[PDB]
Amino acid sequence: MQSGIIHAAEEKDWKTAYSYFYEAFEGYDSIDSPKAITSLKYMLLCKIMLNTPEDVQALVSGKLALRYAGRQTEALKCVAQASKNRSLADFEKALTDYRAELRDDPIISTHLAKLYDNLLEQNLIRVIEPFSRVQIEHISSLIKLSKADVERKLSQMIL
């Protein structure tokens, strides 16, 4: 478990560390509920952070996850769904709703800020796609945010 922890601590390999979490959970399988229950948060956190969302709902849909279903895996369900749908408001909604269940990450600052800043252009790729010559106040409306940071953000995009 703490192999995946520190191997994911620098955010360089989000696959093998996922293998450390999977291995540690398999070790905790059917012998330690409190320790096995926490592995899912980190495995699915590393998968969604890996940008492969649907296999999260697939894993929780596995029969092994049914043994260890709960409010936390449900919290990962809505998060993976909001990430899949590319919603700046769905993600904020689940973050606000399951905040106490969400605080459990040892590092919620980088893990939430990085995924969020992913979610920005995740939103922009859909909310910018259907048009070419736009006036920016409307897109600031659809994004539901100020337009200055939108200018710097999209400028970062073309740059």
Partner 1 sequence: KEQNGDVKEAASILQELQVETYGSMEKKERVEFILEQMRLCLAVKDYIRTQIISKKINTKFFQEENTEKLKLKYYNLMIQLDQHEGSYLSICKHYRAIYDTPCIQAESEKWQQALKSVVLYVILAPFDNEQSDLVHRISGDKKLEEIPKYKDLLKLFTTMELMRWSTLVEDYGMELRKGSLESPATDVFGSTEEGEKRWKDLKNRVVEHNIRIMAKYYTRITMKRMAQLLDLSVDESEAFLSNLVVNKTIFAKVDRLAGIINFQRPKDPNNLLNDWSQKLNSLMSLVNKTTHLIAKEEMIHNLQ
Out of 31, 109, 129, 159, the only residue in the binding site for partner 1 (CB under 8 A) is 129
* Contacts (Cβ under 8 Å, ≥6 apart) of 21: 1, 4, 39, 42, 43, 46
CB atoms within 10 A of CB 39: 22
CA-to-CA separations, 82 to 28, 68, 87, 131, 136, in angstroms, rounded = 29, 22, 6, 23, 25
Q: Within positions 55 to 94, which residues make up the interface with partner 1, using CB under 8 A?
A: 61
Phi, psi (5° rounding) for residue 68? -120, 40
3-class SS at 55?
Answer: helix
Q: Kindly report the length of the chain.
A: 159
Count of chain residues binding partner 1 (CB under 8 A): 10
CB of 139 to partner 1, least distance (A): 10
The residue among 12 and 63 lying less far from partner 1, judged by its C-beta, is 63
Among 93, 126, 144, 152, binds partner 1 (CB under 8 A): 126
Q: Are 88 and 115 in contact (CB under 8 A)?
A: no
Q: Which is nearer to partner 1, 33 or 141 (CB)?
A: 141
Q: Which is nearer to partner 1, 6 or 136 (CB)?
A: 136
| Residue 138 makes contact with partner 1 by CB under 8 A | yes
Contact range with partner 1 by CB under 8 A, out of 12-20, 31-39, 132-140, 149-157: 132-140
Euclidean distance between CA atoms 48 and 157, whole angstroms:
22
Among 133, 146, 158, 159, binds partner 1 (CB under 8 A): 133
**Positions that interact with partner 1 (CB under 8 A):** 61, 126, 129-135, 138
